[PDB]
Amino acid sequence: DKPKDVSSITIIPKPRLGFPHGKGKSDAVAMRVNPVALTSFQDVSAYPDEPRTTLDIARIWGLRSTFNWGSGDEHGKELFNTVLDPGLRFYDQDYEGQITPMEYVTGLYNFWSGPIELRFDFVSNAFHTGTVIISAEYNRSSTNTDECQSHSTYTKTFHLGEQKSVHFTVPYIYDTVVRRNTASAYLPVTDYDKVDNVSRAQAMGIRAESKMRVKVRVVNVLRPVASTTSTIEVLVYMRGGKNYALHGLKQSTYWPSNSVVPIDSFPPDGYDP
Amino acid sequence: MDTGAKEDEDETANFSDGVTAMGFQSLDTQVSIKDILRRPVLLFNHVELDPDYTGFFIPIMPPSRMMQYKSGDKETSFQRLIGRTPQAAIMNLFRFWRGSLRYTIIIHSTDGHPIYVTHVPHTGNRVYGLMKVNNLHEYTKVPIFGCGLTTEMIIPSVNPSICVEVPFDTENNWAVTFDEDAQRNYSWRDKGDTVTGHLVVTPVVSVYMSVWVEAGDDFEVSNFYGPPSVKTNDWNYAFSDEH
Amino acid sequence: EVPSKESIQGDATQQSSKEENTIITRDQQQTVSENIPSTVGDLVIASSEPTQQFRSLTNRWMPINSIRVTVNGKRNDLLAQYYIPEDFLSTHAKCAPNTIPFETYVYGKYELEMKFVANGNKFQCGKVIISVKFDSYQADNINTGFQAALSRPHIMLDLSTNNEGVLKIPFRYHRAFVRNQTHKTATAGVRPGKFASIYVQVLSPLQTGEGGANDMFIRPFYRYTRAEFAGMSYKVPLT
C-alpha cells in the first residue's frame, strides 16, 4: 500500500544552530568516516593542575609593581600609592610591560567583582626593621601629607623583622554588585591614529574611572644596621580573591607587543634559498 | 601552572572574602575556558575566490598571536582584530592543543553552482590563501575535491553556509599553537607541527566568502605558559566620566 | 623544621637528601614545586620493544656550572639558561655518569629534579626565580619574563636566608619521545635533545652594605627521577 502522510508541522528556518553560544546544541557535520566518532582522550588528556576556568588563571600570583623604602623616608610618607583597578593600570599614559595574570584575564571581560588579594615581599634580611601601614580607601581619597586620613580606613599594620611577607585581602565595598571595566569594549584603531575630541565623542563607552586606592605609609622609619643596605625594594604581588567573578566577554584590553610577526605561506614564499 | 600559594607562609588575621557574585545577574556563566574557545571567531572578511587556482587554503590552527596584525608591515587577507579577541588571548597562554576544530564558511551567493570543502590531512606544509598547486594552468579536469579526500559541499540557494568539524589528523600527541617567529626558516618538519591540516574551498565561478572558527566539543588545551609582555592605549580613545 | 640552641657544631638540625651515591645537606628550610604528572600510555604504542631504566646511573645528583649574581643585574635579566637534555650532555658536566645511556639510545622520556643552593651573606638581600618552560623550541624569546616565570612551575630563592629550592619537571612534549643525539647520517628535519628550558632570572636586584661583597654564587644540581630509554643503537660521542 501507498497511504498518504497527513502529519505536518510549522518550522522556522535558521541558517546556523547555536552560533553565538559556547555550549548547548550544534548542527556540525564531522569530516570523518564515522559521523559520530570523536578524538580519544584515553592516554593523552588535560593534566589535572591546568586551569579549567579563567577564575583559576585569576588566582595565579603575578608581580604587579615595585617600590623603594629608605632610612631617609620620614614617617607618614607615601611609599606606594596606586588606583587598584584590575581594568586599567594607568588612565593618563600608554602602558608597556608584563601585566599580571588576573589583570590579563580581567581585560577579556566587561564586568568584575569580589575581593582582590595583595602580598608584599620585602627584599631584606634579619637586620632590617621598620613598620608600614597598608590602607584601602574607597570613594573619597586622602591627601599625600595627611597620614591620619589614611589611618581612618581599612588598614593592616605590618611589623617587619623576621617575617618578610604580609598578605592583604582588599575587601570589595562599592555601590554596585559589579563594577564595569574602564577599558573600551571595542576599539578599531590599530595604526596609532592621532586622537581628537571628535574621535573621543564617538567612543564605544564612557570610562568610569575608579577612585579606590591602596596606599602604603611609614609608621616606624626603617632603621637598618651600618653593615647592611640603607634602602630595600618591596615586591607587590596581586591575584583575584577566592570569590572573584567576571562577566560579559569583550575585545581584549591588552595585546602582544614583543616579537609579533604575521604568518606566510611555507614553503611558497621564498623559503627555498 | 603554579598558584604561588607555596610562598604564602603568612598566618595572620585578614578581612572577609564575602559572598560570590556569580549567578547573580544571570545563570549564564562565561568564565569557563572551554566555553570561550567554543565561541566563533572571524578570520577572512569578504575575501575573493577564483576558479583559476587549485582553491583557497585555510590552515587548521586555533586563532592566536600567529594570526595577529602588527602596525606598518605587509598586508594579509587575515582580518586585523584576530590579535585582540578574547579567544586569541586564551590561546596565547597555552602552547599545546588537541581535538577537533569547527570552521564555518559563508558564501556570498544564491546560485546553483556548488562550492566544495576538503579536509586535507597533516602533510607538513603551512600554506594559506589562494595557491596554484604544482603551478598548473588548468584544475577543472583534475579538481582537489575529486581526488578522493573527505569532502562536503555547499549549495548556496538551499543554504549558503556550512559548519564542518575537522578531525585531529596528526602523528603528534599535541598540535603546537604559536612560535616566537612565524617567518623564520628553521628545520622543516617542526614548522609543520603548528597545523593539523588544511581546509580548501573551490568554487565553479568567482565568488566572495567569509570564514569563522572555534574549538569543537572534543577539545583540550594544555602546557600553560603564563601571560606575555603586552602594550595598551585604550585610555586614549575615550572620554573620562568627568568630561 | 624547628631550630635548636647552639652546640659545638652550631645549630645542628640539618636535613639531607640521599640519592644513589650522592648526598646534599641543607641548613634552612626547603621550597618544593608541586609534584605533577607526565604523558603515559603512548609509551607502549610508540615503542614496540621494551624500554629500559638505569636508576643507579641517572638518579644521582650531578652539579653543573656555577651562576654569578652581581649587584649590577637588573630585574628580568637572565643569569643562566639550559636547553635540556642537550646542555646536560655536551655543555655542562660532559664526563658525568648520568650521560652514559644517552650515547647508546636514540629516544627517551625524562622527568627531572633540579636543586639550587645559594650562599650570600646575612647583610645581602635579593630574589631569584627559576622556572621551567615545557617544549620551548622556537618559543624562547616570548613568554620569557619574570611575570610568565611566576605563572609556570617555579621555585623562589632568597639570597640572604640561603633556603634551597627543588623544581620537579614532568615530561610534557608534543611528540611521544625526544631524540637524544644529532648525527651526520640522521635527519636535519627535527631538532634533537631539547624538550624544555630552565631560566634563572633576577626577580629583584642584589644589594649589599658599605664595603660589602659585590657578588655571590648559586649552584644547580640535576637528577632524572624517571629516565626511560628506547631504540638501542651503536654508541657515539655526545655532540
Binding site: - | - | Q81, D140, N141, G145
Partner: peptide, 26 residues
C-alpha cells in the same frame, strides 16, 4: 631580503635559534 628568515650568527646556534650562551636577548 626578509630579515626574519635567518638570525644573525653572533646571537644564534647552528639550529637557527637564539643560543643558550647569549643571555642579553632579553
Amino acid at each position: 631580503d626578509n630579515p626574519h628568515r635567518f638570525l644573525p650568527a653572533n646571537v644564534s646556534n647552528r639550529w637557527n635559534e637564539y643560543s643558550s650562551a647569549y643571555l642579553p636577548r632579553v
